[PDB]
Amino acid sequence: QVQLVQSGAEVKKPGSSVKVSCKVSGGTFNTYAIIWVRQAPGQGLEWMGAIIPFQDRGQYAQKFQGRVTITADKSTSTAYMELSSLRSEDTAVYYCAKESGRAVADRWGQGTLVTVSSSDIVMTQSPASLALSLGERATLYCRASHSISSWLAWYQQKPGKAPKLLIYKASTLESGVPSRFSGSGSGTEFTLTISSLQPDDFATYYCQQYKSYPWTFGQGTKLEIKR
Amino acid sequence: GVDELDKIDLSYETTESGDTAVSEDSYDKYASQNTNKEYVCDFTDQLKPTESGPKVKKCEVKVNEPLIKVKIICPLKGSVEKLYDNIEYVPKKSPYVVLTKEETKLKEKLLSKLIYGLLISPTVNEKENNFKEGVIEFTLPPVVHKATVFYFICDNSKTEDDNKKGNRGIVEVYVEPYGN
Amino acid sequence: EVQLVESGGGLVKPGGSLRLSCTASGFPFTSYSMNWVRQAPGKGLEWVSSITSSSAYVKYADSVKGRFTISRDNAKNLLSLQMNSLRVGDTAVYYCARAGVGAPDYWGQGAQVTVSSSVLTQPPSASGTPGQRVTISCSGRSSNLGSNTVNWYQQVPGTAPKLLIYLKNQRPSGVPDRFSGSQSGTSASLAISGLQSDDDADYYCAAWDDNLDGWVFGGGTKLTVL
The missing domain is CATH 2.60.40.10 (Immunoglobulins)
Incomplete structure (x- = not known):
């Protein structure tokens, strides 16, 4: 299956630049979009930009515009994200x-830590945290400030790992996801339900709209075991 | 741009996989049948309902030389009883209208506003140049300045015979620059 | 039906x-x-x-x-x-x-x-004994066979032409695998393997002609099974 390999960690001083690589092996590189998403320590996911390599031009979020560059070398199937005027932030x-023909980003790199030391759809997710026991029904809510039709995805993020796609198009389970997961909702209100909790389920879950750039994430629901 | 507001559907959105849930790394990818100046994508036997369906059949048309003629064949409903009852093609107005990838979804674009100087003849042999009759055609110009990718769809995945399901056809026309 | x-x-x-x-x-x-x-x-x-x-x-x-x-x-x-x-x-x-x-x-x-009161060129005759692989050729110009695929018909006298090969090498359902067709430039031919008496008939090649904007046929070839 497709595998995305990123460059190693990097420590940078304030004001300098950093370039992170991303090598795609397996699958097709030139006609599918490469996405760049960052996650501050203990924070939520934040879309930065994307690129379809054959176009040789990237699209960016306003926060980083004038400050970031996304390139793609088609000969090496390698995408780059360069971020200048770095901050501690x-x-x-x-x-x-990478998207794989289903609109959603369903293939993720391992992530690259960068430490710096000397009218957009708003997704609202509840509850912020949820403490339940095994065998119990879990229900996570997610609201979009503007209609997103059914272009909504649900990610599971374990500590130290990258987001793992569980449900796309609001209720389509990714392959390999057990049936106890289910998605629902259309327009502005969506739900993720775990019919009977299992040990592997306890993690942090994010919803994300992919109707229109800039893709936006909810602040996640930490679902942990009850004492 | 005007003339586009009158011929394309700005609200249309789809994906390469459609509703098959097949990622691109599991597509059955294959190249067009290229003979001299004519590159052909023939789905006549690719989309029949099969036990393992729905599958995705992607025909890759790669062009880096001038005056190439692209022919795409999509079987009609009724051509074989039961097998293509629910077959569909997109865009309905092919090849005048094609699909291009905007962000990460396929949306409608006028092919004449994408590859300038293109030639679309109104007829294919004696037939109309439209999937309604089963075949579309267009001839690329002697010069193309920028890389261009656009798609056609011939989807039989909604057709069901026995417990078998049809496959979803995809054509990708990747036109690399040529002619300087 | x-x-x-x-x-x-x-x-x-x-x-x-x-x-x-x-x-x-x-x-x-x-x-x-x-x-x-x-x-x-x-x-x-x-x-x-x-x-x-x-x-x-x-x-x-x-x-x-x-x-x-x-x-x-x-x-x-x-x-x-x-x-x-x-x-x-x-x-x-x-x-x-x-x-x-x-x-x-x-x-x-x-x-x-x-x-009562411009064309495709085929050999006038073709022959072969049962079981042989006989060949019928067809040549044209760049306005037809140089830019359009060939097709082949079999007509028994008194009945309508029956389509055997379309789009150069495709066989309609019900046409045996022993019928095959090839094409190169302005030339093409039909191959009939396992020749049998049931093949004794006329054979026409057909292709679109862009100059004429219509279908052009070959003069026809009579295949006799000896």
Whole structure:
């Protein structure tokens, strides 16, 4: 299957630049979008930009415009994200991701830690945390400030790992996801339900709209075991 | 741009996989049948309902030389009883209208506003140049300045016979620059 | 269960008129263009006219331009050919033929029309003993075979042409694998393996011609099984 390999960690001084690589092996590189998403320590996911390599031009979020460059070398099937005028606030793990013909980013790199030391759809997620026992029904809510039709995805993020796609198009389970996961909702209100909790389920879950760039994430629901 | 507001559907959105849930790394990818100046994508036997369906059949048309003629064949409903009852093609107005990838979804674009100087003849042999009759055609110009990728769809995945399901056809026309 | 049934044939005086009709069954008539091809007694196939599904584009052969008019009514699954200022040269069987992905794939038995008071090159003859692999060649110009795939028909005398090869090398369902066709430049040929007496008949190659804007046929080749 497809595998995305990113460059090693990097420590940078304030004001300098950093370039993170992302090598795609397996699958097709030139006609599918490469995404770049970062995650500050203990924070949520934040879309930065994307690129379809054959176009040789990237699209960017306003926050980073004038400050970031996304390139793609088609000969090596390698995408790059270069971020200048770094800050302590730019300290984060930077992920590259790829869409695979289903609109959603369903293939993720391992992430690259960068430490700096000397009218957009708003997704609202509840509850912020949820403490339940095994065998119990879990229900996570997610609201979009503007209609997103059914272009909504649900990610599971374990500590130290990258987001793992569980449900796309609001209720389509990714392959390999057990049936106890289910998605629902259309328009502005969506739900993720775990019919009977299992040990592997306890993690942090994010919803994300992919109707329109800039892709936006909810602040996640930490679902942990009850004492 | 005007003339586009009158011929394309700005609200249309789809994906390469459609509703098959097949990622691109599991597509059955294959190249067009290229003979001299004519590159052909023939789905006549690719989309029949099969046990393992739905599968995705992607025909890759790669062009880096001038005056190439692209022919795409999509079987009609009724051509074989039961097998293509629910077959569909997109865009309905092919090849005048094609699909291009905007962000990460396929949306409608006028092919004449994408590859300038293109030639679309109104007829294919004696037939109309439209999937309604089963075949579309267009001839690329002597010069193309920028890389261009656009798609056609011939989807039989909604057709069901026995417990078998049809496959979803995809054509990708990747036109690399040529002619300087 | 696709069938095409012509009517209107008969004997016409030189200079008179005649309306041919063809009624279709078994397929969505609104999804298929239609043709008329004629075969004079003892001679070969000559395309006459074509009309698209929606009647947006009609095409005629110069043999009949000015005198013939093609039309259709899809509510009546009807195809029609008005034939004016007729001549003895117009004496022929008049087949109505549904357009295919290549050459017309289904033909009617033909309306006999008697008026009484640029081309593909085939060998006139071909022969072989049973079991052999015989070859029938076909050559044209760059306006037809240089830019259009070849098609092959088999006609037993007294019946309509039967499509064997379309789009260069594709076989209609029900055509054995022993029939195969190849094409290169302005040349092409048909290969018949396991030759049997059931193959004794005439064979025509057919391709589109862009200059003429119509179907062109070969003069035909008679295959005798020895």
